[PDB]
């Protein structure tokens, strides 16, 4: 449903996990 | 997971553990994609060559887990299966083509801080994200190496770049099809890592920078061992089989 993909302890609480930058930096 | 690290609490709330009832043993990874639909590799439930033919009653699906072993009260939820659906054109005789199955829980599961679905890709997300050099993330409780690390205490996580189809095809003698992609560092690249035994069926996920959501691009299917130089992990291409997923959900939901 409409909520998929956003993590209650991460996105919804505007926090970032330790290695998710690695991911974003690879799109560049 | 080889050369990864411990996952954070609720870092992967769509993570599902398939657990055999007897013996009381981890079977495979899986993911939650709705309140009643779990997605896995077909080879986790059906592989006649190893006398594997699990039915509804033989397993349970444990959601919201962190520890590999501990029952985690008021955090994990265990549900019973109503029905398994194996892709009808899944090819166990040859190359695990269309390595994908869906499981439908008996009753809906309660979302919480530890339990929450991942998104499936649409055309555009797929078209944007599935590109060599771009990294996805793999999670599971499988082995820390192929052969004093053995089995991890808690969910392991690793980030691996998608790999150009010709390099995937050159790395193995197995026929690799369009319903599959491969991922992993090249021997040159200085970094390493991979899934391993016990991680099959788990999700290969990517975070969209457009909308900050996580999408499951892949299912851990197979590799030639784990983290071997010159070898890559192979994943079922979730997009290419989305029609089947939609089809089954839309008919049995
Ligand atoms: C033909 C091919 C689809 C595959 N067939 C099968 O595995 C049939 C048994 S079903 S169980 C599959 C899962 N386990 C394996 O693949 C295991 C261990 N590796 C993994 O689990 C994964 C590593 C990276 C990813 Cl991604 S998964 N592979 C080998 O033992 C192996 C060790 C050496 C060679 C191979 C696997 C070659 N590959 C296979 O045999
Ligand atoms: Na490798």
Numbering used by the authors:
A (entry chain L): 1C, 1B, 1A, 1 to 14, 14A, 14B, 14C, 14D, ...
B (entry chain H): 16 to 36, 36A, 37 to 60, 60A, 60B, 60C, 60D, 60E, ...
Question: What's the publication's text?
Answer:
As a proof-of-concept, we screened the macrocycle library for inhibitors against thrombin, which is the central blood coagulation protease and an important therapeutic target. To overcome this, we herein established a combinatorial approach by tethering a myriad of chemical fragments to peripheral groups of structurally diverse macrocyclic scaffolds in a combinatorial fashion, all at a picomole scale in nanoliter volumes using acoustic droplet ejection technology. In screens, we identify nanomolar inhibitors against thrombin (Ki = 44 ± 1 nM) and the MDM2:p53 protein-protein interaction (Kd MDM2 = 43 ± 18 nM).
All inhibitory macrocycles contained the chlorothiophene carboxylic acid 14. The best three hits, M1, M2, and M3, were all structurally similar and based on scaffolds of the format cyclo(D3-B5-Xaa), wherein the amino acids Xaa were all α-amino acids with hydrophobic side chains (D-Val, L-Phe, L-Val). The purified macrocycles M1, M2, and M3 inhibited thrombin with Kis of 44 ± 1 nM, 165 ± 38 nM, and 125 ± 8 nM, respectively. Indeed, 5-chlorothiophene-2-carboxamide, mimicking the “side chains” of diamino acids acylated with 14, inhibited thrombin only weakly (Ki = 380 μM). The chlorothiophene group points into the S1 specificity pocket, and the macrocyclic ring fills the S2 (disulfide region) and S4 (valine) spaces. The structure of the M1:thrombin complex illustrated the contribution of both the macrocyclic scaffold and the carboxylic acid fragment to the overall binding and inhibition of thrombin. Thus, our crystallographic analysis further validated the approach of screening large macrocyclic libraries with diversified peripheral groups. We demonstrated the efficiency of the macrocyclic library synthesis methodology by screening and identifying a high-affinity inhibitor against thrombin (Ki = 44 ± 1 nM). A unique feature of the inhibitor is that it does not contain a charged group, and thus could serve as lead for developing a drug with a higher oral availability than dabigatran etexilate, an approved thrombin inhibitor that is a prodrug.
